[PDB]
Amino acid sequence: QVQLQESGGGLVQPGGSLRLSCAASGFTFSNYKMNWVRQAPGKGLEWVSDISQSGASISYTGSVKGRFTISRDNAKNTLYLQMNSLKPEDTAVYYCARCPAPFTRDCFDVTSTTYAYRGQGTQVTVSS
Amino acid sequence: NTASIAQARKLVEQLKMEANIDRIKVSKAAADLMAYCEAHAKEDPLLTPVPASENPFR
Amino acid sequence: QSELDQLRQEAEQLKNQIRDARKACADATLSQITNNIDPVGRIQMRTRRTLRGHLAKIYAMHWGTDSRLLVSASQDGKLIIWDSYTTNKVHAIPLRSSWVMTCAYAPSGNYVACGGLDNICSIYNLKTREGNVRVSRELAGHTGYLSCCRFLDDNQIVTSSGDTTCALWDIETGQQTTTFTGHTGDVMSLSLAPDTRLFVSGACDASAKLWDVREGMCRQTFTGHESDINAICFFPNGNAFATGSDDATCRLFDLRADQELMTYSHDNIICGITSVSFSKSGRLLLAGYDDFNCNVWDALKADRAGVLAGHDNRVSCLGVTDDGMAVATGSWDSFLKIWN
Amino acid sequence: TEDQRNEEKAQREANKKIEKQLQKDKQVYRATHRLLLLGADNSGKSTIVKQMRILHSGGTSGIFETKFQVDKVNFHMFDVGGQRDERRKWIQCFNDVTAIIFVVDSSDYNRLQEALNLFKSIWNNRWLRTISVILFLNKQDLLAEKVLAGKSKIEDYFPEFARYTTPEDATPEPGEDPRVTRAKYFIRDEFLRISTASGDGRHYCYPHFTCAVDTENARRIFNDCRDIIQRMHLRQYELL
């Protein structure tokens, strides 16, 4: 039974700091690639970042470059996201997702609606 | 809102029906599989090859 | 949100209860009580037929109940019916749409079914008084590409589609009689039981489900695999089934124990499975791979007994005759071969 | 003797007559080129196909079809619009096409990353290797006024744009503004960077600039198909 369970979040003031945690079980964590995806109010799912199997070749979206950081821990089957200097428009629900195949470079349907290998999500709010 | 709620209902009353089914120990199942597989050993041309005089292919 | 959270809690509690119920029955493992039986590692076979004439890659084939005639489908837009013994072509049907990905052959031998990426299933009459094959019925109503179909008899047929549902049809009226709506991902394989009382399916959500044809409901679900499922087959006695996935493993499930009890894998295998089948007795398990090789597994000892080689592009389909006399395989190189 | 007669009827009547028709159909199959059309809903791919159909089958159920001819050569184009959101299974039915047509809305900064990710995924797929891509940047006319208005900036979506400089190979139109050319070529280079990174010598990409009122799109596809088929024929004779 593949399952992903996010953790962390809550309310934070503008310019604050926060970090999220994702716990995975039911599959070989070291084989797959991992992703972060979010959905803002009144909008669809959006790309954020990813990290490869060994921890090299990281990538980010232009909106969060210089502020967000991603990392793995293969020895504990957990995924992290460090967030700094948060802005009001970062308010959204963040999900933990993995690409469908165990040794490929393809991540077609991670942002699709009703995607299977994705978690439930956590709420993050930035307000004064 | 209501659609996700209804999906959650359908899920839980599916789990109701799935949780009540009867079950048996794995020993009986494995023994039955082995017994059936052993009983029909003589009736498998692939498991035991066939003389050329009877093979429709060559 | 409070009600949604409450329902999630109830679902979690029932999941825990079912998992605990499963663990109680695990008194013994099959590998630990089939340890003393003899092996079958001498299996080796050779190809001695090659059917040629398709222009493009092949997706599906199916055997007839006489175990002499068979049909195949290719995405160039043709269905060809072959004579296995003499290798002569007996029919060639041009299709309306070229993007076909499934076909079936009636148990009585009067009809053949077809369909694919156009969301429609087509029925052809092979024995009309005029002597020309002609379309007799078209079934519509799915909202996704047709992936599999299997005849029950001359008048009804079952199908699965990419819209996450399956259906039972009445060919005379052309209307759906029942709909099965449990899966979460695309469904692309189904298997009829020997008594045709029930059937099983597998989907992209890494789960399989057991369906009652008449009651139109599900009563079992299996969650062993960890990726997309694309092949499934029944055991000869009808008390178990086997599954293949793109995580490079095969697994065996028991209907009455409601649990997984065998896995077939090797360290140096990284490709995914595309096909599965059983021999007549059930001792052998045959599966196709994206490495265009086919491995023969000792289903009861879990070791490899042989390998079939000779294709040079992805193996797409696989089938065993109703009397177990031969095995046929297709591939993306546009050829089809018969073994042993 | 009846066995001999049945064998004669089978082998003579059925097999040879079937093989004759198959041989007839093989030439028609080999003489035609088939293409796959991809794009988002906001793109004008439907406008492109309608426009080049006006320059010169029908109906749709699961798939839509299009016919056009240039220099007496036949092209078939398919648009898979009847499916749901996930692509990863029905996409690999098209491993044999000659080329893929990819259309992007150049004036929409917000949705550009999604198209870029889709392009990367298509480029690096196992079964879609060895297939070239024709890339169309569709809405230059809107991009020009969007840039010249100055209300929305590009560097808020792509911070590397601040350091970019126009290449020496740029060929601006006679009446074009230099900063329009800068942004336009930056957007093109974003795709070319992914294309040239993992692309082996068996795989190429062909970018183009186009507009809604355009009529050369039919000939460009012909010219690119020419190049890739020529490379294939060079390759088979050990000249590449």
Next chain:
Amino acid sequence: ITQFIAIIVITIFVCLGNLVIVVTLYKKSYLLTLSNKFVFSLTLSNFLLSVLVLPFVVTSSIRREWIFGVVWCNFSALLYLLISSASMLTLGVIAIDRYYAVLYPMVYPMKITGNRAVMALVYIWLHSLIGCLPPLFGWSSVEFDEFKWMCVAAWHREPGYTAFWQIWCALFPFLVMLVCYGFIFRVARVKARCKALITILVVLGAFMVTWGPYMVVIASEALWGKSSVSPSLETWATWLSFASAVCHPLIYGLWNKTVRKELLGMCF
């Protein structure tokens, strides 16, 4: 005696190399595409040449005289000339086919069809037969040449035919190959951005290294008489011509990927 082994080596190679290719093409009938029929004819004709002519050359080289009858003197020479001319012309036809394939890819499937291929195949052999008509009649004499060790046309005593055949059967296909591959080379060079140069040089040199010395020897004998060339050079020039049939099967067979794969599937 160092010479005598050379004929046996050449004969075994010429026989076996062509036999393998013709058997592979015949059994795997679906490989007979439009372009492979030229290779089929080229290999079959050379295989037939390997047995109807060569053993008599061995016997004449040992006995140092024509022991057989006058009847077989004419037939052997006629077959030699006919098959040689046909083999030379087939290469030019293949070059034309490749030129059209590479320079006009989109129009190729309709511009060239099976019927026109059959017409070209017929035209090759009609051209060859027109090239050998005069020896067949009484217009030219055929006799046993000492250091050639075979029956062939008397080049030294008939300066007209020795120029007619030389110009009409050899130079024309060579010029055709030269121009066709020259046109192919520049396209390959432009779109390479040196395998093309190596391949073209190999293909073009396999022809002239083998059929070159014989032509100049014939010309020298016709111009200044029999005494103008040493016997050893005459023998070696004649014997290099038979080595032409060794390069044809290798180059136009085994170097092709599909036929090589199919052959290895049968030979392992």
